[model samples]
Target: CLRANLLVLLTVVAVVAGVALGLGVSGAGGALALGPERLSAFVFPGELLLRLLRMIILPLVVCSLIGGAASLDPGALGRLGAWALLFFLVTTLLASALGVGLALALQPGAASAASKEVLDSFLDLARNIFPSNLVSAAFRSYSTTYEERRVKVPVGQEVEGMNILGLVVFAIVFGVALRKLGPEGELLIRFFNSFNEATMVLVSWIMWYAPVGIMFLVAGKIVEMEDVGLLFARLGKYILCCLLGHAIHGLLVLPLIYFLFTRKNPYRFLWGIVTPLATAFGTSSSSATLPLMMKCVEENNGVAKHISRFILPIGATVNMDGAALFQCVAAVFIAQLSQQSLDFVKIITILVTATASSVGAAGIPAGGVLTLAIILEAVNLPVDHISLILAVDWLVDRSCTVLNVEGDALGAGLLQNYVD
Candidate 1:
């Protein structure tokens, strides 16, 4: 406990120190300053972190998703599965919608604030979901590029970036097929489970290195900021928008749902899981906090063992309310930065993609950012602006984990009430 607490404190210190170092060096006369030529040296560790995470992304997504899908035993496909699925789906959809709504209202990127064909864009999204070239899909996805033919015409282009949507679709269906094989499938399922376990262990190791990476990433971003004041102003609003969405979902919407369903005082139930929530905040990982969540829900909060065990595990894997909210706002904020108009179709695209990507949002620190790329791609937003988002993600990601934990706990409670 002390070790993990110390890590959190160290990360906090890193952020503060990085910001101070950045400000000092970016000024005209810091003794230890970084010129643009040498700035790469300072941020090299940060770049390494990003590369490492990307290296693990494909394996992590495929293995974990297959394991998650295969483990949903057919026996549980009755009322419990139905209710839990319904609750998770509704809450996650609401969270994405809230994210998009709040970002528009708050205009975090409104520093404030596109002619892609509606059909072509949607087709690109769908086509990639069923990628034809699996090998190329690993590195590049299908996208539509416009060609001038008197009027603009759509043409297929191989865009750089993993076709994650197609991978997700394939893995999920593959896992389901494996499950259909009964005993014959057990070997493959076990292999995926083991692979996923190893991947998560690797992620935790990366988490240990994050403070170092995040420090340099923030400092480098600060040095590169053309308008420091404006950047901070926009980032401040972005953080505000994210927290507000999380607050509404965690404090208001979740409780209201709990009260409506269980007819109990929601705060009282929430109070029981403070330890898990705190752990989630410090770690920025719902999966890491899952055991504690189960313990609190069953032992402290009077949720049954069977219910907590079943629902909480699945929730950690798929019920990513916090991530959904963050992805939506980040996507729209990127649009705002690009000066792209948020048309009706684009807004719906953001909504759907955000909701879908949240499922693949790994339950690890800053996991939402990985999937945020998908939303940006779906809307044809420039992806490089993600650096700005990364600069402040450490702060926002903690709250996202807390909100995710809260949602999982509430979901377990609702399941308990229903089962009883």
Candidate 2:
């Protein structure tokens, strides 16, 4: 196990270093100008990650919900359900507020003087949020066709004017109803559970190529950000700030919560969860770390298998404290950069939108970027500002993804103790 971990660590470090060096020499524009075929080669890694994420999302959701519902005691369902909802709501709200707060503090967006024309263009995009029809909405505007089972247009153009929050509400209602079906739901639930297992197996199979994928993704990101000059220099501060916040939450806040609620020693608890946290940091993928996290919770943390299974999966989908915080910070910084003074009401709006976007964000490559676009639109900020952050996104994403996975594991631990 140590040898295997060493190999994984060496591979990730090598890829990141190689990409960083390439960026220093070639620059983003030069790398892109290297020809479409070459650029496509660089992008292949992220593409694979995107495909893998899309493949598993539906099965994971369906099976996880069904399993949670079927196994939950009918008498305790009401209380458990209420607790789950409340947790989801409160965490999301807090995350959004955190994002807004950090952004206001940092004001990263203010570095670029956005033109009125650019601002106006963004305003037009913001106004284009309403879906014209259900069919168009599902086909074009939806984040994933997993629920509908078809790919239509490019995701960016398609999701324009669609309401992601509305769709999540609909999905939750459907999941709840499916869960309540009892014996009648058994065959369906079992099938979905089996399918979920199969999908995870597929994920494992795909992960063998993770090194190559990471290489491509890192290389492409480096190439994209290469030409930004001092932009890369400034990224150090953002990365540090983001990492510090994550460390505080994972090491301090989560542990405090655990000790106060479960009376568990934070040291041992952290040690127990370290494997998943490390894996998440390496892969920058919460979904990919799900199996490892579940194993850790069950074996190390003494969480019941059933509770771990149910809560971890749901947490994977809904509990995004890290992502939420990043979004809030990014949005506020963008607003500040644009020289826009965000009052309390504007901050509240940002908090709500960022939180909502977190639940709505699909677990895929550049997923956070897309969600950030949505948040930008909500605040009348230019979607193109995303171009600025895209430079350092990989570094930021690696940290945030780890936080997201850690938050899921922490949530599972908390829920386990609460239920017990």
Candidate 3:
């Protein structure tokens, strides 16, 4: 275990250092110039891990929902479901609001030295969020470059953009119908559970490649930032602000919630979940650390098995305080960067979109990026600004992911003591 932990830590450090170096070299354009192809090659491993995460998302959600529904008492499921949704919505909104407040204060987006044309192009793209077809909306392509450009496709053909709300509606309907089917649902739920287990096994296999992928991703990002001569120094304040906000949420807000609701000593609860939280921080993956989180909650906190089984899984699906915060901050940062004075209407829109997106944002690879795109569009921010955040995404993601995990665990504690 020690060896494995050390190796993982080393891999994470190497990736961060590599990205910093790569960006430094690219920005400096001196003796360290690596061609675009080489840079792309270096980032490919990280991208692959992201893709692998995506591959498992749909299957995992389907299976987990089925399992959740199958295990619930039929008479009580309805009220429990309603309560869960309410908790998710309320917490998400609060988190998103906090994020926007921090971003407005920090102004990470204001560092863009790009031209008005670039900004205008991004605005134009943002205006086109309404999809004509729901099916086509689920697979919209995104540009990886700093510039805003039209997405390339076959002549007259467009890639579908995702309507996250639509997707959530679909998942809920599917889950409810499965719940109503009784025996067949049980059979299907068992199959889905098996499938979920299989996907988890696959995730473990994929994780073996994580170190290499992380190294390349970090290296490429750092090198690219270095080449631009605008490494974290320029955006360091905003990044730190986001990190600070997450720390506050985890160290203060969550603990307060638990103390008020459960009378549990916050320190004990925090210590008990430290291992899973650290795993999430390192991996930047809530879903990846779900099993460990469940174990910690049940074994350390003595949460009832049934309650943990129910609440934790549901929390993983829709309770995303950290992501909500990120979206809120990013939206405000973009507005500040654009010198666009945001009014109450804009703030409310951002808060709503950020909160809603967290529910629909699967804990898959690059899921935050995708959800951020949705938030940007909602608030008339340039989506291309996403590239700016991407530079430090891996690092900040690690911090926020722990916050997300902690939020889920805290939610479980609150429900266990107050509601149950």
Candidate 4:
């Protein structure tokens, strides 16, 4: 573990050096002189690493969930499920409120022009997320296609109308249904558990190469920037608001809740999970880093296998403390940018909708933005302000993703520590 820590630490340094080299060596004449795509090729090694990491996660999640569900007492399982859901909702709600509060205080998106653009399509968008076809929910835009059975995508960027939240909802119900089969489920649970161990072993092998993979991922993202000197002058306050919400939620709230309840050393817990946290930072997706997060929770944090498998999968899909937090901040900030004076009634609407809408903030590209759009529509904020929100989102997405991933790991650890 110490060795793993060092490798990741070194990779963090590599990101800085690589970025400097990329920007420093570029000629004034642009990419003709220094090919930006040339630097993007550095992404390959890191991309390979990330792909391998993602490759295991779906099966890992499915197998782990089914195995955990089938292996546990039905009564105890109910208690665990209730506890996990309880913490997930409360934390998400708190995060949303905090983000809105900070945005109001910071005035990031204060409207220069009070305006309303009625979206006739808003109701239609809501209906889409509510998903009429259960099978459609299972079809993902981000997952890789396996030959026989597994998450499969024909290979392209994440499209509109992706429904990861639905899939997670289905995974939970499916696993529990398997559990209810009684003795008939035993053979299946053992089968999943057996393969799950092998999958975990594959994850262990992948970790040995993680630091190398992470460095390239981070550098590749930074190096590929076309606009080097673009300041956040237009969106600076909005960025700051996002950062403030992130700091309040990630730094203060997470530590307070986890430490007080679990009686664990927050520092040690953070350190134990540091590697996957860094991976999340690099990938900027909970889905990409979840396999590693699962490993950290189980092996490093000493969460029970059953506890971790059950809670983390569900949490990764549905929990978005950071996304929800930033959604409120963005919504109010956009209201300000659009110069709309928010009433107490609308503020409360933003609060509720922000919390509910982030349920679909999956790990796909711009998933947060999609969910944020829903919240914006709920509050009647102009989608035109999406330009303001969209440009700066990737900057904040990295930290928010770390928060999202860490929240899952911490919840799993806390549940096990307190419940056991």
Best by lDDT: 1
Q: What would the per-residue lDDT of candidate 3 be over residues 1-420, giving only the tens digit for each residue?
A: 657355446555655665566656655672346577666776677677656655565455445555655566666656666766776777777777777787777677666663223233333233223334445545542222333346532222343433333333344445567778877777776686688678657756665665565566555545554434344676776787788788878888778877987787987887777666755664577776666576678777867654565667667757888888877787787677778888999999888877766765556435677678767776667777778778777677777777888888887777777445
Q: How well does each candidate superpose onto the true structure, as a TM-score?
A: 0.62, 0.70, 0.66, 0.85
Candidate 2 lDDT (Cα, 0 to 1): 0.61
- lDDT by residue (tens digit), candidate 2, 1-420: 656354346555646665675575365355646766887866776667545644554455445555666666665655765666676667667555655555556555645543122233333334233434435543244332222236432223355433332333333444456668767777776786687677657655655555555566556666655545566566555555566666666677666766787777766766776665654654566666666566667677877765676667666656777787777777776776677778887888778776766765544335577677767777787566677677677667777777777766766677777788
Could you tell me which residue pairs clash in candidate 4? 109-333, 109-336, 109-337, 110-336, 110-337, 111-336, 111-339, 144-152, 145-152
In order, what lDDT does every prediction score? 0.75, 0.61, 0.65, 0.72
Residue 354, model 2: Cα distance from true site in angstroms: 2.1
Tell me which residue pairs clash in candidate 2: 99-328, 99-329, 100-328, 103-333, 109-337, 110-337, 129-161, 140-158, 141-158, 141-159
TM-score-better candidate, 3 vs 4? 4
Q: Cα lDDT for residue 327, model 4?
A: 81
lDDT of 1: 0.75
The regions of model 2 sitting more than 4 angstroms off are 1-50, 105-190, 199-212, 234-240, 265-301, 369-386
Q: Which candidate would rank higher by lDDT, 3 or 4? A: 4
Give the per-residue lDDT of model 4 (tens digit) for 382-403.
Answer: 8777765667666688778888
Q: What is the lDDT of residue 389 in candidate 3?
A: 76
State the weakest 10-residue window (summed lDDT) of model 3: 115-124
Top-TM-score structure, candidate number? 4
lDDT of 1 at 146: 81
